Amino acid sequence: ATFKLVISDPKSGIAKQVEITGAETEKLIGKRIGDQIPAKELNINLNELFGKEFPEDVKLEIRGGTDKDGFPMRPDIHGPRRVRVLLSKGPGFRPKEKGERRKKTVRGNTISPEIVQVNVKLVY
Amino acid sequence: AIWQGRSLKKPSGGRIVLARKKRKRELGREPSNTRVAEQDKRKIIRTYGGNRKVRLTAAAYANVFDKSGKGRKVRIIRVIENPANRQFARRNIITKGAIIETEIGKAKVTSRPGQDGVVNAILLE
Amino acid sequence: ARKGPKRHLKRLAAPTSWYIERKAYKWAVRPRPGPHNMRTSIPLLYIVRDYLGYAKTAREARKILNEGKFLVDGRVRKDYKFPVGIMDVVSIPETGEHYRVLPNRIGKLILHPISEDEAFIKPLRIRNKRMIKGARVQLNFHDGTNHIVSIAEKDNYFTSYTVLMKVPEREILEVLPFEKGAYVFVTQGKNVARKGRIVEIKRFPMGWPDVVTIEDEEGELFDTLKEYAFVVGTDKPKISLP
Amino acid sequence: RDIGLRVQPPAEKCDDPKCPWHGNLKIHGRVFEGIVVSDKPRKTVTVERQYYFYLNKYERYELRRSKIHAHNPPCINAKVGDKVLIAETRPLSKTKHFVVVAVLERA
Amino acid sequence: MEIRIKEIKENKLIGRKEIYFEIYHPGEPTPSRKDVKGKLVAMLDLNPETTVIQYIRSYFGSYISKGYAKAYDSKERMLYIEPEYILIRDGLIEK
RNA sequence: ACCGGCGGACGGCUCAGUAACACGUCGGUAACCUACCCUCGGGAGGGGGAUAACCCCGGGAAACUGGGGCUAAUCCCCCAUAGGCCUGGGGUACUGGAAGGUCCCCAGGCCGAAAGGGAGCCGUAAGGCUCCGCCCGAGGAUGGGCCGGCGGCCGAUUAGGUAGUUGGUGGGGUAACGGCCCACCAAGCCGAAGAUCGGUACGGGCCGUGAGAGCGGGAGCCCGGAGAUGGACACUGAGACACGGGUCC
Ligand SMILES: [Zn+2]
């Protein structure tokens, strides 16, 4: 389970990539979108990564991600399962028409070993 | 959906075969069972041609008039009788023909809650 | 297979009131909704191109119309699909020309030259009369136009009466009543394009229309519908109708 | 009162909302004369009208029947065999689209 | 080759003059557009750079060929009104 | 290039299905809806919020698609007044052949608008002129929905068919009236003048033939109806349950 986690700084609009192979992936696994995790708990030296003087209380907010198959994660579907849902808007669908609905494949909010990329927002 | 097109039996007792698919303009909506509650609940429905309807699902107040045009807003307590259905009286469902009793006595409904979203009634002498 | 409104009109299916070649091409302009009916109307494109021959192509006709060179009822009309109906005044100030649209003896629409002084008058038959919010009376004319008056003047107007309106100012000039001896002009039917004086009016039960008998100049008596009888005078026509 | 027909109204009064004489029902369209053949259904009568149809090829006529179901207002209590007048109205039921307006003659 | 002006009309909404003419000629080739325009301009005193020959049409077994032309008041108006193809055919634009 | 508006429901193709108010004709809707367009009478007041594009970082073999920041509108939301609907009591002002219609006065309630936005020419500014615009009300106009009378094949080696079936009362739903649906009350309704069932078929204007009566066909053009591999469903829109849109077998 090699994650390609993305860290985005809301105060600068800049994002960086960090690839994590094991050990630290277990703590991330099982979490749900909307949960905060201290940066130190992931052995991330984001201060030197971003060349900043980030405080010591920085916390990692997970907002979503994707899979090996490229199907995104809907923060609304419960459980670490892949489902087909008829979507009109929101994550996983781009309407392109006034009111159309198309069926797409998505995954639940909970993180699973199948996840390959996890997006994270820095919370000071 | 709730089709409201032609019947499939002739008046002579014969059988009719559909010559076309169901059309959108011929479709109805689910019945609105206005129930007495502690707070009014209404919804907006977009109808044919872009027009609009106000559907009342829960009714709390009623506008009661007594022989002189003097209207009062009085809370609904219970439904006494409803000739429309034999079970509506027991299920406490308001209907255009229902008879209710409010703080100022018995009244008979004269409006259609499912079509205009208002409960109007006349006091019974 | 039909799901909504039509946008096209085949030439063979065009109204019989148009002086159009029904076999030269396939399509014809579909009139936009407007003042008069489909049968008593013709798109301004045909007036500009065929009737008058001021343009040889629809592109030229559209350019001239957009240049605001044509006035109908005293107002400049730019769209080439505008309906033009009976008792309408078409004005070309640049050439100083003025025409009145009238039915023919065979039901086709024609342009009758008129005088400049007369070009400012439009007759309008009161198709209906009702009351609107407030205490005002609304009059609906044969071309779909509307006018508003006060409750005091309610008795000054009635159905089938004629009103002479000054265009484009939209001002009342005179009211011609519908009564015995009133000069009338037939707008449609078998007796279209005939004129005379009212002689008798007959009513019938249910929704059957009224029937009116008209005496022509030569003395012949004919019949038509009251709605088809258009009042255009009292003793002698106030509008040239030959 | 008159409802567009040159016929005398019924003598007595009724409270049927679907009575053109004493109700909100409006009559418009065709008017027919017929003979009542059935009156069993409640407030309904079947009116039969006979007419001749011309067969071109044989240059001969043939009798034909026209059965119509019409609403029977309480004031106009039509029976079997009566000659009645009916007028077209809005759809009142699956088959009833006419209303009896008067009884031309009673059997 | 003799040109007879059957009709001349003044269009004022479109600032032009419409000329209908007939070219009578005994057995000879159908007259060319350049020759027709030159003769018409010389005869009717028109502006050479503002006349466009709509057509010169010959008929079956006839010595009279009909012709329709237009003479504008303004070069800009001519360019704005006339389609490109007719002007190219008459050789008013180099293409 | 993107947001945003309109259109994409017309046109084009086929005759499968359908013996039916599908089609032809005459009438009705006083029982109903309609963007575009026309006329008249009115209005445009105060606030608020996202996000596309773009930038950083991607994921996915593709098809597609995630996270973070920064923005505008004729984008979206809220408040205010006009306006819309229901009901009760009074006067009769209007059209109609006839008012459950329209108008006026009180009463109880629900719902509830806009874009003074854009362009040009002047004007020191202010302000002005013009062009295309936005919202509400009453009418039209355009395209339809629904209903009625009459008319147009063969089989009796098919004689009985019908049970929401026929009608009623009270309601629901619809844009609209209606057993269209629902709850109860009755036994009604169709039929040898051929019901029911079965065979065949898109209907008409028309065409082929004959001296005519008549017989036969009704693909090409026009009008109307259905279908988009066979079925069944819904979203957006004035209009579709939609040939080059959507969901399931
Ligand atoms: Zn009665």
From Swiss-Prot, chain A:
PROSITE patterns to which the protein is assigned, alphabetical: RIBOSOMAL_S6E
Coiled-coil features, chain-numbered ranges: none
Region span, Disordered: 89-108
Record-level GO BP terms: translation
Keywords (A to Z) from UniProt: Ribonucleoprotein, Ribosomal protein
GO terms for cellular component: ribonucleoprotein complex; ribosome
Xref: InterPro entries: Ribosomal_eS6 (IPR001377), Ribosomal_eS6_arc (IPR020924), Ribosomal_eS6_CS (IPR018282)
Molecular function via GO: structural constituent of ribosome
Pfam families per record: Ribosomal_S6e (PF01092)
UniProt record similarity statement: Belongs to the eukaryotic ribosomal protein eS6 family.
NCBIfam families: PRK04290.1-2, PRK04290.1-3
PANTHER family associated with the record: 40S RIBOSOMAL PROTEIN S6
Subunit structure: Part of the 30S ribosomal subunit.
Name this polypeptide is given: Small ribosomal subunit protein eS6
UniProtKB/Swiss-Prot annotation, chain B:
Listed GO CC annotations: ribonucleoprotein complex; ribosome
Any one GO molecular function term: structural constituent of ribosome
Keyword Ribonucleoprotein annotated: yes
PROSITE patterns: RIBOSOMAL_S8E
Entry's Gene Ontology BP terms: translation
CDD domains attached to this UniProt entry: Ribosomal_S8e (cd11382)
Pfam families (UniProt xref): Ribosomal_S8e
Region forming the signal peptide: none
Stated family: Belongs to the eukaryotic ribosomal protein eS8 family.
Subunit (UniProt): Part of the 30S ribosomal subunit.
Protein name, UniProt field: Small ribosomal subunit protein eS8
Taxonomy of the source species: Archaea, Methanobacteriati, Methanobacteriota, Thermococci, Thermococcales
Swiss-Prot record, chain C:
UniProt record, GO biological process: translation
The family this protein is said to belong to: Belongs to the eukaryotic ribosomal protein eS4 family.
Cross-referenced InterPro entries: KOW, Rib_uL2_dom2, Ribosomal_eS4, Ribosomal_eS4_central_region, Ribosomal_eS4_central_sf, Ribosomal_eS4_KOW, Ribosomal_eS4_N, Ribosomal_eS4_N_CS
The entry's keywords: Ribonucleoprotein, Ribosomal protein, RNA-binding, rRNA-binding
Annotated GO MF terms: rRNA binding; structural constituent of ribosome
Pfam families from the UniProt entry: Ribosomal_S4e, RS4NT, S4
Keyword Methyltransferase: no
NCBIfam families tied to this protein: PRK04313.1
Cellular compartments per GO CC: cytosolic small ribosomal subunit
CDD domains named among the record's database cross-references: KOW_RPS4, S4
Residues covered by the S4 RNA-binding domain: 42-104
Species for this entry: Pyrococcus furiosus (strain ATCC 43587 / DSM 3638 / JCM 8422 / Vc1)
Name the record gives this protein: Small ribosomal subunit protein eS4
Assembly description: Part of the 30S ribosomal subunit.
Swiss-Prot record, chain E:
The entry's keywords: Ribonucleoprotein, Ribosomal protein, RNA-binding, rRNA-binding
Keyword Transferase: no
Family matches, as InterPro entries: Nucleotide-bd_a/b_plait_sf, Ribosomal_eS24, Ribosomal_eS24_CS, Ribosomal_uL23/eL15/eS24_sf
A GO molecular function held by the record: structural constituent of ribosome
Cellular component GO terms held in the UniProt record: ribonucleoprotein complex; ribosome
BP-aspect Gene Ontology terms: translation
Disulfide bonds: none
One Pfam assignment: Ribosomal_S24e
Family named by the database record: Belongs to the eukaryotic ribosomal protein eS24 family.
Subunit (UniProt): May be present in 2 copies per 70S ribosome. Part of the 30S ribosomal subunit, where it binds 16S rRNA at its canonical site at the bse of the body, as well as a possible second 50S binding site near 23S rRNA helix 45.
The name this protein goes by in its record: Small ribosomal subunit protein eS24
Species for this entry: Pyrococcus furiosus (strain ATCC 43587 / DSM 3638 / JCM 8422 / Vc1)
